[PDB]
C-alpha atoms as a PDB file:
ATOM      1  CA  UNK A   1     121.334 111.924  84.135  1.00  0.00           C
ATOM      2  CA  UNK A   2     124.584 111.983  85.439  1.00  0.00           C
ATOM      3  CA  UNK A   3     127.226 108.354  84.585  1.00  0.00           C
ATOM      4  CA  UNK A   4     126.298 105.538  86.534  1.00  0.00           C
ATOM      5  CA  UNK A   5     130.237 105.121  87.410  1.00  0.00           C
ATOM      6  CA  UNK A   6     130.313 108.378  88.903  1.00  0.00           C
ATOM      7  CA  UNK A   7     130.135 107.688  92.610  1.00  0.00           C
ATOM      8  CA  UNK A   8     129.720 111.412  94.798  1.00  0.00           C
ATOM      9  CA  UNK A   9     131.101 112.149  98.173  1.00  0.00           C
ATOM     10  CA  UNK A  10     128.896 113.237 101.243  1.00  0.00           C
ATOM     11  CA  UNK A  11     129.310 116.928 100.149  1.00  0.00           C
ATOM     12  CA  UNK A  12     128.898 116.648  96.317  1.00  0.00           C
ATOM     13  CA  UNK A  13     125.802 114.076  97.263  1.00  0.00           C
ATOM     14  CA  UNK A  14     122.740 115.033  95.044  1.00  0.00           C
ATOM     15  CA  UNK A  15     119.312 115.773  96.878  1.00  0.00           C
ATOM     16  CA  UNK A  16     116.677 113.540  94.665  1.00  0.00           C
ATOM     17  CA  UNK A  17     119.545 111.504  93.703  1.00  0.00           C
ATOM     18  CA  UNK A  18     119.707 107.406  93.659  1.00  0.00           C
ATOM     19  CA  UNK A  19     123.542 106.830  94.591  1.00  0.00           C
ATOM     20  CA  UNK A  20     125.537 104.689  96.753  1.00  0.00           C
ATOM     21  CA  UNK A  21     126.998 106.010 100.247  1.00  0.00           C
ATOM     22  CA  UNK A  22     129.814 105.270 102.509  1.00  0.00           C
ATOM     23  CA  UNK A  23     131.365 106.438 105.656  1.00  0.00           C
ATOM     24  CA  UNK A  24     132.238 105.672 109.327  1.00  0.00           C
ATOM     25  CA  UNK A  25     129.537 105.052 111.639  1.00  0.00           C
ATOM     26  CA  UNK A  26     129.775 107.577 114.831  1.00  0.00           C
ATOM     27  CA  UNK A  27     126.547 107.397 116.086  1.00  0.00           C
ATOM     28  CA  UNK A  28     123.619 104.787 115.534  1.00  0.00           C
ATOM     29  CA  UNK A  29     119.928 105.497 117.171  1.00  0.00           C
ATOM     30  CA  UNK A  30     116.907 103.698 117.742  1.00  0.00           C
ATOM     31  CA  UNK A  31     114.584 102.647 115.003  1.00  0.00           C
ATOM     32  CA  UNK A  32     110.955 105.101 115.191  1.00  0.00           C
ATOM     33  CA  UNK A  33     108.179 102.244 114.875  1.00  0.00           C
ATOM     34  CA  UNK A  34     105.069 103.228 112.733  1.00  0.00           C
ATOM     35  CA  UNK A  35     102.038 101.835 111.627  1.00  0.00           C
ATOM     36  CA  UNK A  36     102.230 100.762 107.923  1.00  0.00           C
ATOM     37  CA  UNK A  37      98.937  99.396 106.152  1.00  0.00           C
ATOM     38  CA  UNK A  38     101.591  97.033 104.933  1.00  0.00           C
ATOM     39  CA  UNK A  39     101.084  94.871 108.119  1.00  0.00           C
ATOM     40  CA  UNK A  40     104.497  94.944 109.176  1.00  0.00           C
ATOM     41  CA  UNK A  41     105.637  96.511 112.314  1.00  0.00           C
ATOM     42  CA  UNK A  42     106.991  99.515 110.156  1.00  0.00           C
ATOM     43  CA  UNK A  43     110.241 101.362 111.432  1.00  0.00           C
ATOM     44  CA  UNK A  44     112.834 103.800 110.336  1.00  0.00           C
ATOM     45  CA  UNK A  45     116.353 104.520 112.149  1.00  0.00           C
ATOM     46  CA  UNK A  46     118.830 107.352 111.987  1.00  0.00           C
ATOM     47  CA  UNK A  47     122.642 106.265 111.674  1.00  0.00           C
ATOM     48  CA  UNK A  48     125.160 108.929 111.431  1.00  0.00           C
ATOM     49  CA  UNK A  49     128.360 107.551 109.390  1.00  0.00           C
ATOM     50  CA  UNK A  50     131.235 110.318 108.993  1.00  0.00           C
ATOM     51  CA  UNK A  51     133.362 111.127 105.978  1.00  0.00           C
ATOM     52  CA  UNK A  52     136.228 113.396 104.953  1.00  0.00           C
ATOM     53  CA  UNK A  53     133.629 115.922 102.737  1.00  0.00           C
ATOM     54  CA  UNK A  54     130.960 115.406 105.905  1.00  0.00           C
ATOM     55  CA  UNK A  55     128.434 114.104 108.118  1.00  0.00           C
ATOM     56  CA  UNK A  56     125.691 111.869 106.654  1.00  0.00           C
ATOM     57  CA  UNK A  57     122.119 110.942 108.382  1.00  0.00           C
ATOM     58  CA  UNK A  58     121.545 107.313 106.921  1.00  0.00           C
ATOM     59  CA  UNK A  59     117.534 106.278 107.122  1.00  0.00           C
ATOM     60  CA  UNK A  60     116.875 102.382 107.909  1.00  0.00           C
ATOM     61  CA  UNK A  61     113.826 101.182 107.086  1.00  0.00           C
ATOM     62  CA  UNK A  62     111.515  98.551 108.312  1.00  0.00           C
ATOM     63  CA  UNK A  63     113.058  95.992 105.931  1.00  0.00           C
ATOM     64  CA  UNK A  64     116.983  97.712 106.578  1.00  0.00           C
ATOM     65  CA  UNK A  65     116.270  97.193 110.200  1.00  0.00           C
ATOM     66  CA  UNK A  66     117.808  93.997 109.947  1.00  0.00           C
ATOM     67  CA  UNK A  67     121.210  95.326 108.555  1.00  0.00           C
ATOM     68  CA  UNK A  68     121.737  97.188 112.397  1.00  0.00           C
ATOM     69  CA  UNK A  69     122.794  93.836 113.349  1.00  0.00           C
ATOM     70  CA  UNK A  70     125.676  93.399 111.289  1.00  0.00           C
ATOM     71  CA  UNK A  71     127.782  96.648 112.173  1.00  0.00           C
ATOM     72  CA  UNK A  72     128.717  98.965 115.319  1.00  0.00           C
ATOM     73  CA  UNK A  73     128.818 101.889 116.517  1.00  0.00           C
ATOM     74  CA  UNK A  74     132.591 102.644 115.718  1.00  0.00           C
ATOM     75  CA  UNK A  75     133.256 100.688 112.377  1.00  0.00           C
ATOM     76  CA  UNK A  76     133.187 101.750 108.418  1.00  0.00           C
ATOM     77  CA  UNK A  77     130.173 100.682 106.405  1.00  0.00           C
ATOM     78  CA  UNK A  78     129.469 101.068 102.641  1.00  0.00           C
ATOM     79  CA  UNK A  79     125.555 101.457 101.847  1.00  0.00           C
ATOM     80  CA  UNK A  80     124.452 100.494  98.566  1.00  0.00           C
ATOM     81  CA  UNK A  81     121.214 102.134  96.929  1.00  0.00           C
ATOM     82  CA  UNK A  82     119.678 104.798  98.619  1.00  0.00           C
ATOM     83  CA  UNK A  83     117.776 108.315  97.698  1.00  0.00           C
ATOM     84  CA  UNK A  84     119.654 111.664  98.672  1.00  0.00           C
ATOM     85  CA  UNK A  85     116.509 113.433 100.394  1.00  0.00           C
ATOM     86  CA  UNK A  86     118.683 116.383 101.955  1.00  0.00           C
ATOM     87  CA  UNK A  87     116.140 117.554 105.414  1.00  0.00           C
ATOM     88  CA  UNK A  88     118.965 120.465 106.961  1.00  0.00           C
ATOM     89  CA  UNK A  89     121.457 122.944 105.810  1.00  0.00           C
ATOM     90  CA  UNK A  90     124.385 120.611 105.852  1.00  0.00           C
ATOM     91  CA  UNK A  91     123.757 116.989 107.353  1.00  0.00           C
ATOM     92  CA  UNK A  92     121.771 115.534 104.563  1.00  0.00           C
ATOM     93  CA  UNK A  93     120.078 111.685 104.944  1.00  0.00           C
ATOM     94  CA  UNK A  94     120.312 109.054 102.661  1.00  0.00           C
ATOM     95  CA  UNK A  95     116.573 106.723 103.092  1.00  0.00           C
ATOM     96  CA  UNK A  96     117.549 102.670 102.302  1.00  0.00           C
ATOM     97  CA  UNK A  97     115.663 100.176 100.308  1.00  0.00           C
ATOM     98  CA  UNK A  98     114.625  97.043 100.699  1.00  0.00           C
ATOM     99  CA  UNK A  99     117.066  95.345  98.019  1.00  0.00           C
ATOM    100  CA  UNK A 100     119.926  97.793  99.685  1.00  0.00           C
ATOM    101  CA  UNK A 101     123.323  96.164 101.483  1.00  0.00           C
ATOM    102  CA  UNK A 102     125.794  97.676 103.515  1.00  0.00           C
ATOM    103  CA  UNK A 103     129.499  96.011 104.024  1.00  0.00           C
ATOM    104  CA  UNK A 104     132.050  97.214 106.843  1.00  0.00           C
ATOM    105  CA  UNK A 105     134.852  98.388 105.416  1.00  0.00           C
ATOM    106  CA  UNK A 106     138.185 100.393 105.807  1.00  0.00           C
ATOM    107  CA  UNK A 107     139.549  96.417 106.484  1.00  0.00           C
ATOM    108  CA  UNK A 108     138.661  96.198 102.947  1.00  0.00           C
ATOM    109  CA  UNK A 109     136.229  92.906 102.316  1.00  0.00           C
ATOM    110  CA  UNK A 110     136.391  92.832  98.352  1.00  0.00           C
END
């Protein structure tokens, strides 16, 4: 495995890689709903954040769905924990877990 302290750009982002992400948000859609045997509504949304190596596709799952109401559709988030899946020559997608955060940023909180 690669250091933990190494933190990748969009284009150097690893495809089966667990890494942190962060970019400006240009475009934010919909969440899909689905029916998990979990019991829970079940939903995943595609948020494309912008950075100077590239576009990223960032995934929001049923339990990230309640992160789209802390940023917009114009500011800079930071999104911590997710798995590099990679679907497209190019724009990969980063897929959120439950225990993942995401911070606005370029008015830098901490």
């Amino acid at each position: 495995m690669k250091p933990e302290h190494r933190m990748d750009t969009i284009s150097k982002l690893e495809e089966g890689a667990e890494t942190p992400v962060t970019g400006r948000v240009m475009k934010i859609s919909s969440p899909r709903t689905f029916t998990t045997r979990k019991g829970r509504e079940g939903k995943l949304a595609n948020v494309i954040i912008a950075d100077d190596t590239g576009e990223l596709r960032a995934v929001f799952w049923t339990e990230n769905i309640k992160l789209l109401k802390k940023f917009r559709e114009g500011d800079v988030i930071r999104i911590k924990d997710v798995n590099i899946r990679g679907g497209f020559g190019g724009r990969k997608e980063a897929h959120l877990m439950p225990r993942s955060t995401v911070e606005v940023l370029d008015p830098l909180e901490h």
